[PDB]
Design an enzyme around this catalytic site. Sequence first.
Site, mmCIF file in Angstrom:
data_model
loop_
_atom_site.group_PDB
_atom_site.id
_atom_site.type_symbol
_atom_site.label_atom_id
_atom_site.label_comp_id
_atom_site.label_asym_id
_atom_site.label_seq_id
_atom_site.Cartn_x
_atom_site.Cartn_y
_atom_site.Cartn_z
ATOM 1 C CG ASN A 35 -1.722 -1.080 1.492
ATOM 2 O OD1 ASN A 35 -2.906 -1.063 1.131
ATOM 3 N ND2 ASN A 35 -1.195 -2.089 2.165
ATOM 4 C CE1 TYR A 69 -6.411 8.222 2.293
ATOM 5 C CE2 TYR A 69 -4.622 9.614 2.991
ATOM 6 C CZ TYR A 69 -5.359 8.495 3.140
ATOM 7 O OH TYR A 69 -5.045 7.668 4.173
ATOM 8 C CD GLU A 78 -8.356 6.337 4.751
ATOM 9 O OE1 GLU A 78 -9.076 5.307 4.662
ATOM 10 O OE2 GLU A 78 -7.110 6.333 4.678
ATOM 11 C CE1 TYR A 80 -9.985 6.325 1.323
ATOM 12 C CE2 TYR A 80 -8.673 6.766 -0.632
ATOM 13 C CZ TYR A 80 -8.835 6.134 0.572
ATOM 14 O OH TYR A 80 -7.833 5.319 0.983
ATOM 15 C CD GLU A 172 -5.263 4.212 -1.265
ATOM 16 O OE1 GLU A 172 -5.848 5.267 -0.905
ATOM 17 O OE2 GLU A 172 -5.438 3.108 -0.705
HETATM 18 O O1 LIG Z 1 -1.013 9.115 6.903
HETATM 19 C C1 LIG Z 1 -1.017 7.684 6.938
HETATM 20 C C2 LIG Z 1 -2.273 7.151 6.242
HETATM 21 O O2 LIG Z 1 -2.281 7.422 4.850
HETATM 22 C C3 LIG Z 1 -2.415 5.679 6.469
HETATM 23 O O3 LIG Z 1 -3.755 5.357 6.059
HETATM 24 C C4 LIG Z 1 -3.766 4.238 5.195
HETATM 25 C C5 LIG Z 1 -3.579 4.716 3.767
HETATM 26 O O4 LIG Z 1 -4.038 3.700 2.906
HETATM 27 C C6 LIG Z 1 -5.381 3.624 2.910
HETATM 28 O O5 LIG Z 1 -5.735 2.757 1.874
HETATM 29 C C7 LIG Z 1 -5.725 2.884 4.164
HETATM 30 O O6 LIG Z 1 -7.126 2.726 4.339
HETATM 31 C C8 LIG Z 1 -5.134 3.586 5.385
HETATM 32 O O7 LIG Z 1 -5.050 2.581 6.373
HETATM 33 O O8 LIG Z 1 -2.183 5.362 7.800
HETATM 34 C C9 LIG Z 1 -0.901 5.674 8.373
HETATM 35 C C10 LIG Z 1 -0.777 7.178 8.351
HETATM 36 O O9 LIG Z 1 0.552 7.475 8.731
#
Ligand SMILES: O[C@@H]1[C@@H](O)[C@H](O[C@@H]2CO[C@@H](O)[C@H](O)[C@H]2O)OC[C@H]1O
Length: 185
Positions: A35, A69, A78, A80, A172
């Site tokens: 990821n 994001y 979170e 989007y 992403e």
């Molecule tokens: O800032 C960071 C975030 O971007 C991270 O969140 C993840 C990003 O990928 C997404 O697909 C996920 O759902 C999510 O868990 O988490 C760590 C933080 O440092």
Amino acid sequence: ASTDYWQNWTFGGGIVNAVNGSGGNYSVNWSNTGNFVVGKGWTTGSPFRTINYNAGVWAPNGNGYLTLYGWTRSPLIEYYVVDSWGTYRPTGTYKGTVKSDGGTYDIYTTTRYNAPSIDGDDTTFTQYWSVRQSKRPTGSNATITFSNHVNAWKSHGMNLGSNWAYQVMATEGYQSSGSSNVTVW
Ligand SMILES: O[C@@H]1[C@@H](O)[C@H](O[C@@H]2CO[C@@H](O)[C@H](O)[C@H]2O)OC[C@H]1O
């Protein structure tokens, strides 16, 4: 205001050449990732911000998103606004649609468990999604009038938190390869 924040988070393996370029420009070249979320934007998100971007290169090879994001706390959400993607169009629990910036978007919520977040590696949070019903054209100057999404989310009981964390226009990727070049302002 122009961008003051650089997002560059990876996990899980592979390669992510994220370049923090001039102005609001960045690029990403990635291969065989776990990821990642890379993007430029603002330290403090706002519900009233209009995010401008131009994705000069949108070249996912597999699963990537071209997406606003961002996070709130209070509570931890979170969110989007997915304008484009590769081979996988993200969804969740259907809540409705919203029209904004020349596109129709589906609205979804998803609840995440035992998941990484701005709070740490094993957390619960809700995700709010606006996902474009079809892929947005890239290479042109684009607007995400985020307030439109915020208002439509609120109309389906999807309220953001009151403490704003970062807000970026991101590339992403999940278990994919590809290239992007994006300018944000
Ligand atoms: O800032 C960071 C975030 O971007 C991270 O969140 C993840 C990003 O990928 C997404 O697909 C996920 O759902 C999510 O868990 O988490 C760590 C933080 O440092």
